[PDB]
Amino acid sequence: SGKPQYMVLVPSLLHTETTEKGCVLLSYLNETVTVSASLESVRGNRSLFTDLEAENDVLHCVAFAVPKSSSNEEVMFLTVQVKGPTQEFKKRTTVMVKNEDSLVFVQTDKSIYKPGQTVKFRVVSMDENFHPLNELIPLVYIQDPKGNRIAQWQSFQLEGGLKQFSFPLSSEPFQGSYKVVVQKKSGGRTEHPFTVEEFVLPKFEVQVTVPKIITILEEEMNVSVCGLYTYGKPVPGHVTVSICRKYSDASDCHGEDSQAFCEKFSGQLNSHGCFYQQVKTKVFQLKRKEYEMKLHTEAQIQEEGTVVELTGRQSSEITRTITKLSFVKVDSHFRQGIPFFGQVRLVDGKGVPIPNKVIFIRGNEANYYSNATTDEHGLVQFSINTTNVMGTSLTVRVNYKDRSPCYGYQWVSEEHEEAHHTAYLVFSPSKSFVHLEPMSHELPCGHTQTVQAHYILNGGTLLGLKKLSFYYLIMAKGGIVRTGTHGLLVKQEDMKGHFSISIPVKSDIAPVARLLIYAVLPTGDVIGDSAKYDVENCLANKVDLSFSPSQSLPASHAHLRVTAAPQSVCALRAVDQSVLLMKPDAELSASSVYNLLPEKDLTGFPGPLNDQDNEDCINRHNVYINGITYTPVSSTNEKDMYSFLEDMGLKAFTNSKIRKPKMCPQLQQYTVRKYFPETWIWDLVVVNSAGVAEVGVTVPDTITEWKAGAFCLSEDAGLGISSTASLR
Amino acid sequence: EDCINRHNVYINGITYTPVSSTNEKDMYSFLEDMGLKAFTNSKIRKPKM
Amino acid sequence: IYVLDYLNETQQLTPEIKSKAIGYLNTGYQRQLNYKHYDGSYSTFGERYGRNQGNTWLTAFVLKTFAQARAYIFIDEAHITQALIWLSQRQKDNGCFRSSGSLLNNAIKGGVEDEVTLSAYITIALLEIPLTVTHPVVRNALFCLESAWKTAQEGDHGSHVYTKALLAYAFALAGNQDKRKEVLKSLNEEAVKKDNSVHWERPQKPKAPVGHFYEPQAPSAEVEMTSYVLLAYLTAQPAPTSEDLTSATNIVKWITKQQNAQGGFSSTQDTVVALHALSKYGAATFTRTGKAAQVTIQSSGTFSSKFQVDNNNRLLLQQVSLPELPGEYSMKVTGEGCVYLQTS
Amino acid sequence: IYVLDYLNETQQLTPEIKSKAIGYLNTGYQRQLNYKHYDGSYSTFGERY
Ligand SMILES: *[C@@H]1O[C@H](CO)[C@@H](O[C@@H]2O[C@H](CO)[C@@H](O[C@@H]3O[C@H](CO)[C@@H](O)[C@H](O)[C@@H]3O)[C@H](O)[C@H]2NC(C)=O)[C@H](O)[C@H]1NC(C)=O
Ligand SMILES: *[C@@H]1O[C@H](CO)[C@@H](O[C@@H]2O[C@H](CO)[C@@H](O[C@@H]3O[C@H](CO)[C@@H](O)[C@H](O)[C@@H]3O)[C@H](O)[C@H]2NC(C)=O)[C@H](O)[C@H]1NC(C)=O
Ligand SMILES: *[C@@H]1O[C@H](CO)[C@@H](O)[C@H](O)[C@H]1NC(C)=O
Ligand SMILES: *[C@@H]1O[C@H](CO)[C@@H](O)[C@H](O)[C@H]1NC(C)=O
Ligand SMILES: *[C@@H]1O[C@H](CO)[C@@H](O)[C@H](O)[C@H]1NC(C)=O
Ligand SMILES: *[C@@H]1O[C@H](CO)[C@@H](O)[C@H](O)[C@H]1NC(C)=O
């Protein structure tokens, strides 16, 4: 009936030391076919050959895998060969290869030390997945402030996929900021900085709640201060604070205190709770040229003489922009045969909406000027009838094309942000197309989602057949993480409207969540459109913590526990977080593990490789307007399936009409016994098939917030992350 | 007066590509070379935007 | 560089001209680098505006020259590999490369810009590199080449000459000695043997109205066709024979007598390729070491004769004359050191 | 080139950075040749006048 077809998909940024998977459609006649994606290096010889029998209209996904290579990085020719009994297809491109870097990192016992103390830290190995691997390390070492490598441990191996080390410092070794660092077989290097110094233990974090954000239209300001302590108790004493504008009218150079207007407030901590203050922003002149606010709050804790400060909410921007609407579910695209709708939001200032404020729509080259308002959330839904021209660029505003108060005096600092967004459209010489209404917001995990799509089929099966398939893919992490399918029995010759899908959010999928899906024509053409979902920091191997409750009066018998996979392991941390009140730790979250990676996302092919240029130029001697007058030659600019799948991050092989029919340029030319503070737990545990409960033992006269950290591992599930059991 | 200038050329089909003049003959031009002028409402002129 | 090869092979080389040429080389190299494409390709201007796409043929010429410059002096492999992938990117699954024309003149070039000949000059300049004849790209090229040869051959005309001989050479690279000698014989079909040597032309006149003066769009391309033939008969896997080298020498005589007194030859293309072929001629024949020849000629009529050829008398010519109406003249030579002998 | 010396002396060296800097150096050498005087001397600009 229709034409015989195929399609096969894969990233461009390969990896090594594991398998990396692509997928394949075949379909349509003499389907007793085979394939092989031949990865064959260009210079010399090599071949990671792979072969496969080819069925029809099915997505089985094979995952070949990769050894190391001679060079670190290289191109690689991929070439596919297909052989049906009466059909075939051989097609090639280039691919990136990379004798990778395993993203690896440290956890330490401390972010600080004192004289005579002892380091205690750990490290991690990984693959693409966070299913760890066993390998051997060249070295990991320590570095003094002065380049003086202060010790060594060498030639160790990872079977745990972590390992744990130690070292004793001497009596008066180097002050300043120490450094602990590694390197790899390839030479990749990585740290975990910290300091050694001296300090009295703080039993109090001065803490406040004061605007992150004052803005232009603010006449005074709210101020509030709160002294947490041992145990979060309320503290007495005296406090003084400095709400401060910066970088004053003086020159700042060697005779001029750049610290601009500091308004100083003296508070006396009452018996319980919090001192409060309402502060006037007149004297800061929250106006044209005076700089971001910095705010320093300092508690003279009584009966101790101690004070410390926290620069709270340093990054306050008193931004000229105000009534700052924001796009949220702003589509990137639109079509000439669809009712689309950017579902749109508004917010102001601090980050909160107003309800019931009128605004003006602007439809430019679709000629849709209009008016609308705010709801409880400032959430609005314009929606537009579309029989218009290619390039559309859109906005709605609450003010007009000028800065209404004293715009161009060069001395004024007020603005209304205005909506800005560009959207493009598909090419589809069928004039059939798709376009989707995503769930464009913060994606949960531990759930799934159904995903509505809108299918427009001019002619559909022109001759073809009554049935047609639907094929969706979710890669992430430059990988492939899930996949599946659907279809529908096609109405003869109309444009049937709506249906949706499901997809789960178990794990294995990065903060990315790309989706595409494409519904083919056996004629030899296809459509399909993209997606994107802000996955949240979610993991394969689940874990939390639990413990025998809080107990003062150092009862030594005292437990702690975790749930985790049945044959597993954990690496753990406790701290009396007094020293670690004085200073935080550094970026210890599952998001850290995520963002350390090689190529979190992949959009766009890599550098060296360029494209997959085609020969099919179409330039007429002149465009041939039989009619009004001959319109000349020039290019276009619109979106493409090729472009959808490259912005996806990847490439495929077909012969469908994917890339636009782009054309050649112009050829023609010219009771208590002190046990050790500043550490409680640094030890290791295995996970039986019912969970551990270790007895981490009580410790005297050390009374505070005690965060405590957990890490775990397994071959079958992965790494380990969960929050703080404050066994205060 | 009749200007048919589209904002963009609306070149339906595969892609969009700009406009320019022609160079062809006309009744208008037949009658001008002829020697004379006429009054008539009809479509004689090429609709030179 | 093929000149330096001439010097080295024939041994006529001082370090002075050698250093002169070296400076020349480095300079021309880098002046070339200023005209490339960041993909790896080359155009006549290129840089300072990305309002172009580079040519291919040029880049292949570049690739070859880069190869030989590597063969003596230092040069970056990065650039050959980039131009190589660029070629591939201008490859079709089944069809050949395309003349992505961005040139200025054609007398620089020694063909008709036929896509197959284009691809052919490419792949052959490739396989002169250390290349696996089983490589993917070149396998595809060879399918092009083979199909192309068939249509050239069974059809009465396929340009009849040069297409065909360049095909001969790439076939020579393969291992396809059978195809090699076959198309070799097809070249000998329209053979142009002379009083004392041979050659080929293009088909002796272009049939259409052509010429008038200045070789307009037609640089007469008469030598490089023979140069690659001088590779064609020559180069193989194990080592060569008599017949190959006899025909070689014939055209070599055609070549050197076709050499131009101003310097070089009619162009740069022919000049390069002739020098390459002559260099490898010597690189086989001219044994700078082989120095102990000895000979006897014996006729049944006992017209004896004895000679010697040695480095001290290397370009010597010990002629000797011959009266017997019947020839009975049995040659015999020995020892080391190559000899070309001629009688009439 | 004193960097290369360092790279070779202290032994921390691969052929790849080597090749890179070789290309660099032939290049900068020639670019310098384009600033000489025919006597042999050099200048900020030199050639072309
Ligand atoms: C000219 O280029 C050659 C590379 O082709 C440079 O190396 C030379 O390579 C030739 C091989 O053709 C060597 O000759 C060899 O002689 C040995 C016996 O000693 C023999 O067993 C081999 O079969 C071969 O014939 C030659 O030794 C070698 N170097 C020379 C010629 O001294 C050569 O350095 C270049 N000459 C220059 C730069 O002037
Ligand atoms: C790197 O720079 C050196 C110059 O310092 C270049 O020549 C090298 O010189 C060293 C001596 O510093 C040579 O080492 C020698 O080892 C032998 C034992 O085999 C010993 O008897 C000598 O006393 C000396 O220590 C070395 O052989 C020589 N060449 C090398 C290092 O390969 C060298 O060419 C430079 N390398 C480059 C070009 O990167
Ligand atoms: C191909 O690569 C292999 C890898 O060791 C090497 O041994 C071989 O020489 C290369 N070429 C051929 C023809 O096998
Ligand atoms: C296989 O597909 C071709 C392509 O349309 C078709 O014409 C043929 O009937 C099918 N079966 C064969 C070639 O035996
Ligand atoms: C600020 O504090 C006052 C009371 O002093 C309270 O009425 C108000 O809600 C707080 N927030 C403001 C004014 O932004
Ligand atoms: C916007 O237009 C609507 C009509 O739909 C009108 O009710 C409203 O008053 C207009 N907005 C303003 C600023 O008046």
Ligand SMILES: *[C@@H]1O[C@H](CO)[C@@H](O)[C@H](O)[C@H]1NC(C)=O
């Ligand atoms: C939107 O308005 C246009 C006006 O041309 C109309 O053609 C179209 O049918 C409307 N949308 C729908 C879904 O009918």
